[PDB]
Structure formats: structure tokens, C-alpha cells
Amino acid sequence: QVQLQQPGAELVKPGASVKLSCKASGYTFTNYWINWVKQRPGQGLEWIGNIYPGSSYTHYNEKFKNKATLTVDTSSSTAYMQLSSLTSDDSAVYYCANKLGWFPYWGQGTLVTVSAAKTTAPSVYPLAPVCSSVTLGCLVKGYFPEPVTLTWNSGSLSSGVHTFPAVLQSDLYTLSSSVTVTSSTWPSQSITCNVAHPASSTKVDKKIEPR
Amino acid sequence: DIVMTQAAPSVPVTPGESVSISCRSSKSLLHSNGNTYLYWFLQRPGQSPQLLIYRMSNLASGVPDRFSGSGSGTAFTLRISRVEAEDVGVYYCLQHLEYPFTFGAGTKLELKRADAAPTVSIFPPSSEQLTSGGASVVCFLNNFYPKDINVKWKIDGSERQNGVLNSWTDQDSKDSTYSMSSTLTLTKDEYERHNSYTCEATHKTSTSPIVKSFNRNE
Numbered sequence: 001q002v003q004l005q006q007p008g009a010e011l012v013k014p015g016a017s018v019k020l021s022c023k024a025s026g027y028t029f030t031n032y033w034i035n036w037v038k039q040r041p042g043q044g045l046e047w048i049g050n051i052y053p054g055s056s057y058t059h060y061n062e063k064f065k066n067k068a069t070l071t072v073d074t075s076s077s078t079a080y081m082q083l084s085s086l087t088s089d090d091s092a093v094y095y096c097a098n099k100l101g102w103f104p105y106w107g108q109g110t111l112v113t114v115s116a117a118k119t120t121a122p123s124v125y126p127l128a129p130v131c132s133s134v135t136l137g138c139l140v141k142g143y144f145p146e147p148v149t150l151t152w153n154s155g156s157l158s159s160g161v162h163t164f165p166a167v168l169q170s171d172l173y174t175l176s177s178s179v180t181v182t183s184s185t186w187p188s189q190s191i192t193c194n195v196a197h198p199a200s201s202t203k204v205d206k207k208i209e210p211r
Numbered sequence: 212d213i214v215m216t217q218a219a220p221s222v223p224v225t226p227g228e229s230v231s232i233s234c235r236s237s238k239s240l241l242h243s244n245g246n247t248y249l250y251w252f253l254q255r256p257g258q259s260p261q262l263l264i265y266r267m268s269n270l271a272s273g274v275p276d277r278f279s280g281s282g283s284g285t286a287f288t289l290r291i292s293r294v295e296a297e298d299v300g301v302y303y304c305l306q307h308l309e310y311p312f313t314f315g316a317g318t319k320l321e322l323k324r325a326d327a328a329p330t331v332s333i334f335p336p337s338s339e340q341l342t343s344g345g346a347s348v349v350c351f352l353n354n355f356y357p358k359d360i361n362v363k364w365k366i367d368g369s370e371r372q373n374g375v376l377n378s379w380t381d382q383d384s385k386d387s388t389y390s391m392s393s394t395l396t397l398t399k400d401e402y403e404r405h406n407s408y409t410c411e412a413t414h415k416t417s418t419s420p421i422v423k424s425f426n427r428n429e
């Protein structure tokens with residue numbers, strides 16, 4: 001499988017630099033270009049620059065020439081982008097992408113949050129119905145920074161799911177998700193919320209129990 | 212630099228209709244080698260861009276043939292036949308003829324589906340959260356259309372406004388509806404001081420609100 005692996009997130013202090021990694025597998029890392037793309041929440045894509053791993057030849061978008069430095073480690077098949085003196089304008093999702101012949105493959109992207117605040121793990125709460133179909137929920141409250149990844153029954157249950165975008169309020173994020181199944185199905189068959197928060201290396205599971 | 216212009220910030224179509232997305236370049240993308248260096252990608256919320264078209268008119272493997280790309284040397288079109296829920300997202304063109312590589316600003320596809328009233332569900336604070344010291348009451352307003360909707364919370368019959376946190380999803384990838392989650396956060400003492408909790412949803416599909424409620428000590 002051709003794949004590019006990127007960390008889900010990086011919390012960086014204002015003014016400090018950050019070095020993003022992009023680990024490649026599934027093809028010969030040295031023979032293809034690694035490109036880097038920036039995307040602010042809700043905005044469009046921007047090309048930052050690229051590098052040829054076998055030789056480290058690089059091209060930069062003038063706009064990012066004084067901000068980014070691209071390198072690679074052929075011995076670990078990893079590409080890196082170091083960004084200097086971050087400010088709030090650097091908060092964004094940064095993707096790495098390669099090009100094999102005509103085909104580009106993208107990493108899942110790293111969400112860089114420039115902040116002086118400390119990383120805070122979420123409190124995950126199961127939402128069972130008040131003491132046809134039934135709707136269950138999961139509340140992921142008070143974390144920072146973005147993002148969190150939420151699934152149900154480890155990704156097995158995906159139909160009838162609504163995962164709401166995280167909303168920032170009082171300097172902490174809150175996100176929630178609901179899932180609707182046939183009532184005869186629950187609680188006989190368990191339903192569990194799996195929440196992962198990259199920045200705090202935490203991954204929790206909350207089984208929804210009847211009240 | 213080559214300027215890639217996508218004239219339409221957004222385009223609305225109702226499910227089933229065909230649609231065309233335009234992108235223009237400030238200079239011909241047709242190389243002397245005969246290839247036209249233009250890509251079209253679809254990006255869905257929270258996903259990395261996905262390849263649709265390469266070489267201006269080649270359909271990428273795995274992409275439904277409802278999609279196609281054509282163009283002159285500077286005017287390009289991405290055509291989507293029989294638009295459906297999974298096609299909603301932002302479409303981007305990209306030229307890779309010359310450095311620096313440049314993207315179009317993107318065109319958002321919006322699906323104007325049929326109106327639908329929200330299905331509401333209310334949830335009291337979890338025992339875990341209460342033990343923890345706080346109390347959040349959640350209401351989900353699901354699968355409704357259009358996007359505009361309002362929620363009012365009432366504690367013991369009186370409207371409560373501070374402590375509310377609302378969030379709308381993007382159009383559902385399967386039925387193109389929207390859903391919204393509203394969370395009322397109180398202190399545990401506050402929560403334990405009242406009994407009747409209600410969330411009322413008003414959507415244009417009706418003048419009377421869809422409401423759900425519960426009594427704490429029942």
C-alpha cells in the first residue's frame with residue numbers, strides 16, 4: 001500500500017519552531033518527490049514546497065522560503081519540514097504528499113496549534129437514554145488542543161453516526177457524537193465510544209450503559 | 212506564477228442533477244509533450260484531498276465514472292453526472308506545469324435536498340460527570356434540512372442561555388441532511404437545584420417546536 005504517516009498533532013509555543021515528520025512506506029522513498037501543503041481551518045490548500053529524497057533537491061514557494069526548511073532521512077524513509085518562529089498564522093493542518101508517476105498520495109496531515117496553553121486530555125462521558133430506534137451519545141469535553149478522533153465499536157458501527165465538529169469555548173474544546181441503532185439491538189449488543197486525543201497520547205473507551 | 216481561477220466559491224445542485232465546476236489558468240497548461248498538467252481533487256471535511264482527475268482528463272482509478280474532466284488549454288471543467296450525497300465537499304484544481312505549484316481557491320458543492328424536520332433526543336448528565344463535579348445536558352437535533360435551526364433550553368420552565376454550546380455537522384455523506392448538537396453545561400449544584408429540563412427545537416419545517424424533556428428526580 002503506498003502510505004505517508006504523519007502525527008495527528010503538534011502543540012507549539014508562540015515563537016518556538018516545530019519539525020513535522022512524514023514517514024513513507026510501500027515504495028522506494030528515494031525515487032519520488034515529497035511535497036508539503038498548508039491548510040488553515042476552513043480555508044484552501046497552499047503549496048509550500050517539495051524535495052527529492054534521493055538528492056535532497058528542493059523547490060520552495062517564495063511565500064514560505066523564510067519559514068520552511070525541507071529535509072529527509074533516507075535511512076528511515078522519512079521526510080521532514082521544519083517551520084521557524086511560529087505565530088498564530090502558522091496554526092494549520094500541514095499535509096505531506098508524494099507523486100508516483102501521475103499519482104499523488106497524501107498523508108492524513110498534522111494539525112499544528114500555536115499556543116502557550118498546556119495540552120489537556122478530554123473527559124469522555126457516555127450518554128445513555130433518559131431513565132423503533134434508540135439514540136446514544138458520547139460527550140468529549142474540555143480538551144486542548146485539537147484534534148480528537150472518535151469512533152464507535154472501534155469503527156465497526158459507522159451508519160447512523162453524527163460526529164459534531166469540535167467547538168472552542170472558554171479556551172477548551174468540546175465535541176460530541178451520536179449514533180442511532182434499532183432498539184431491539186441495544187443494550188443486548190454493546191455500543192462503545194472510542195476517543196483518541198493525539199496531543200495527550202490518550203485513547204479511551206466508554207461503554208454506554210442503561211441508566 | 213500561474214493563477215488558477217475557480218470562479219464559483221460554491222455551487223448548489225439538487226440530488227440527481229449533473230453539475231459542472233470550472234477552473235481557468237493564466238496560461239496554457241498544455242505542454243509541448245502533449246500532456247496538460249492539471250489535477251482535480253475532492254476534499255471532504257476532515258479528509259485529505261482525494262484524486263479525481265489527472266492529466267486534465269484521465270479519470271483516476273477507483274473514482275466513479277460519473278466524474279469527468281475536459282478542457283481547452285486554459286479553460287477546464289470537472290463534470291459530475293447524477294450528483295449524490297457522497298459527492299459533497301470542496302473541489303480543487305491544481306496546476307503542476309510550473310513552479311510554484313498553484314491551487315484554485317476551491318468550489319464547494321452543496322446539495323439542495325428536500326426539507327426535513329429534526330429528530331430530537333435529550334440526555335441528562337452522566338453519573339461519571341456528576342461525580343466529577345459538573346453537569347452537562349445534551350440534545351441532538353438530527354437529520355434535518357435546511358441548515359438554519361434554533362434551540363431554546365428551559366430549566367423548570369425558565370429559559371437558560373449561558374452555558375450553551377452548539378455545533379452543526381457538514382451535510383451528511385449519505386442523506387445530505389444536517390444535524391446539530393447542543394450542550395447545556397451547569398455546575399452540579401445548579402443541576403441538583405432544579406428538576407424540569409427541556410430543549411426546544413424550531414425549524415422552518417414547522418411553526419411549532421420539536422421538544423424533548425425530562426425530570427431529574429423521575
Ligand SMILES: O=C(O)CCCC(=O)N[C@H](Cc1ccccc1)P(=O)(O)OCC(=O)NCCc1ccccc1
Pocket residue numbers: 033034035037047050097098099104242248307308309310312
Ligand atoms: O521545469 C519544468 O518544465 C517542469 C516544472 C514542474 C514539474 O517538474 N512538474 C512535474 C511534472 C511535469 C513534467 C514535465 C513537464 C511539466 C511537468 P511533477 O508534477 O512531476 O513535479 C514533481 C512534483 O513534486 N509534483 C507534485 C505535484 C503535486 C503537489 C501537491 C499535491 C499533489 C501533487
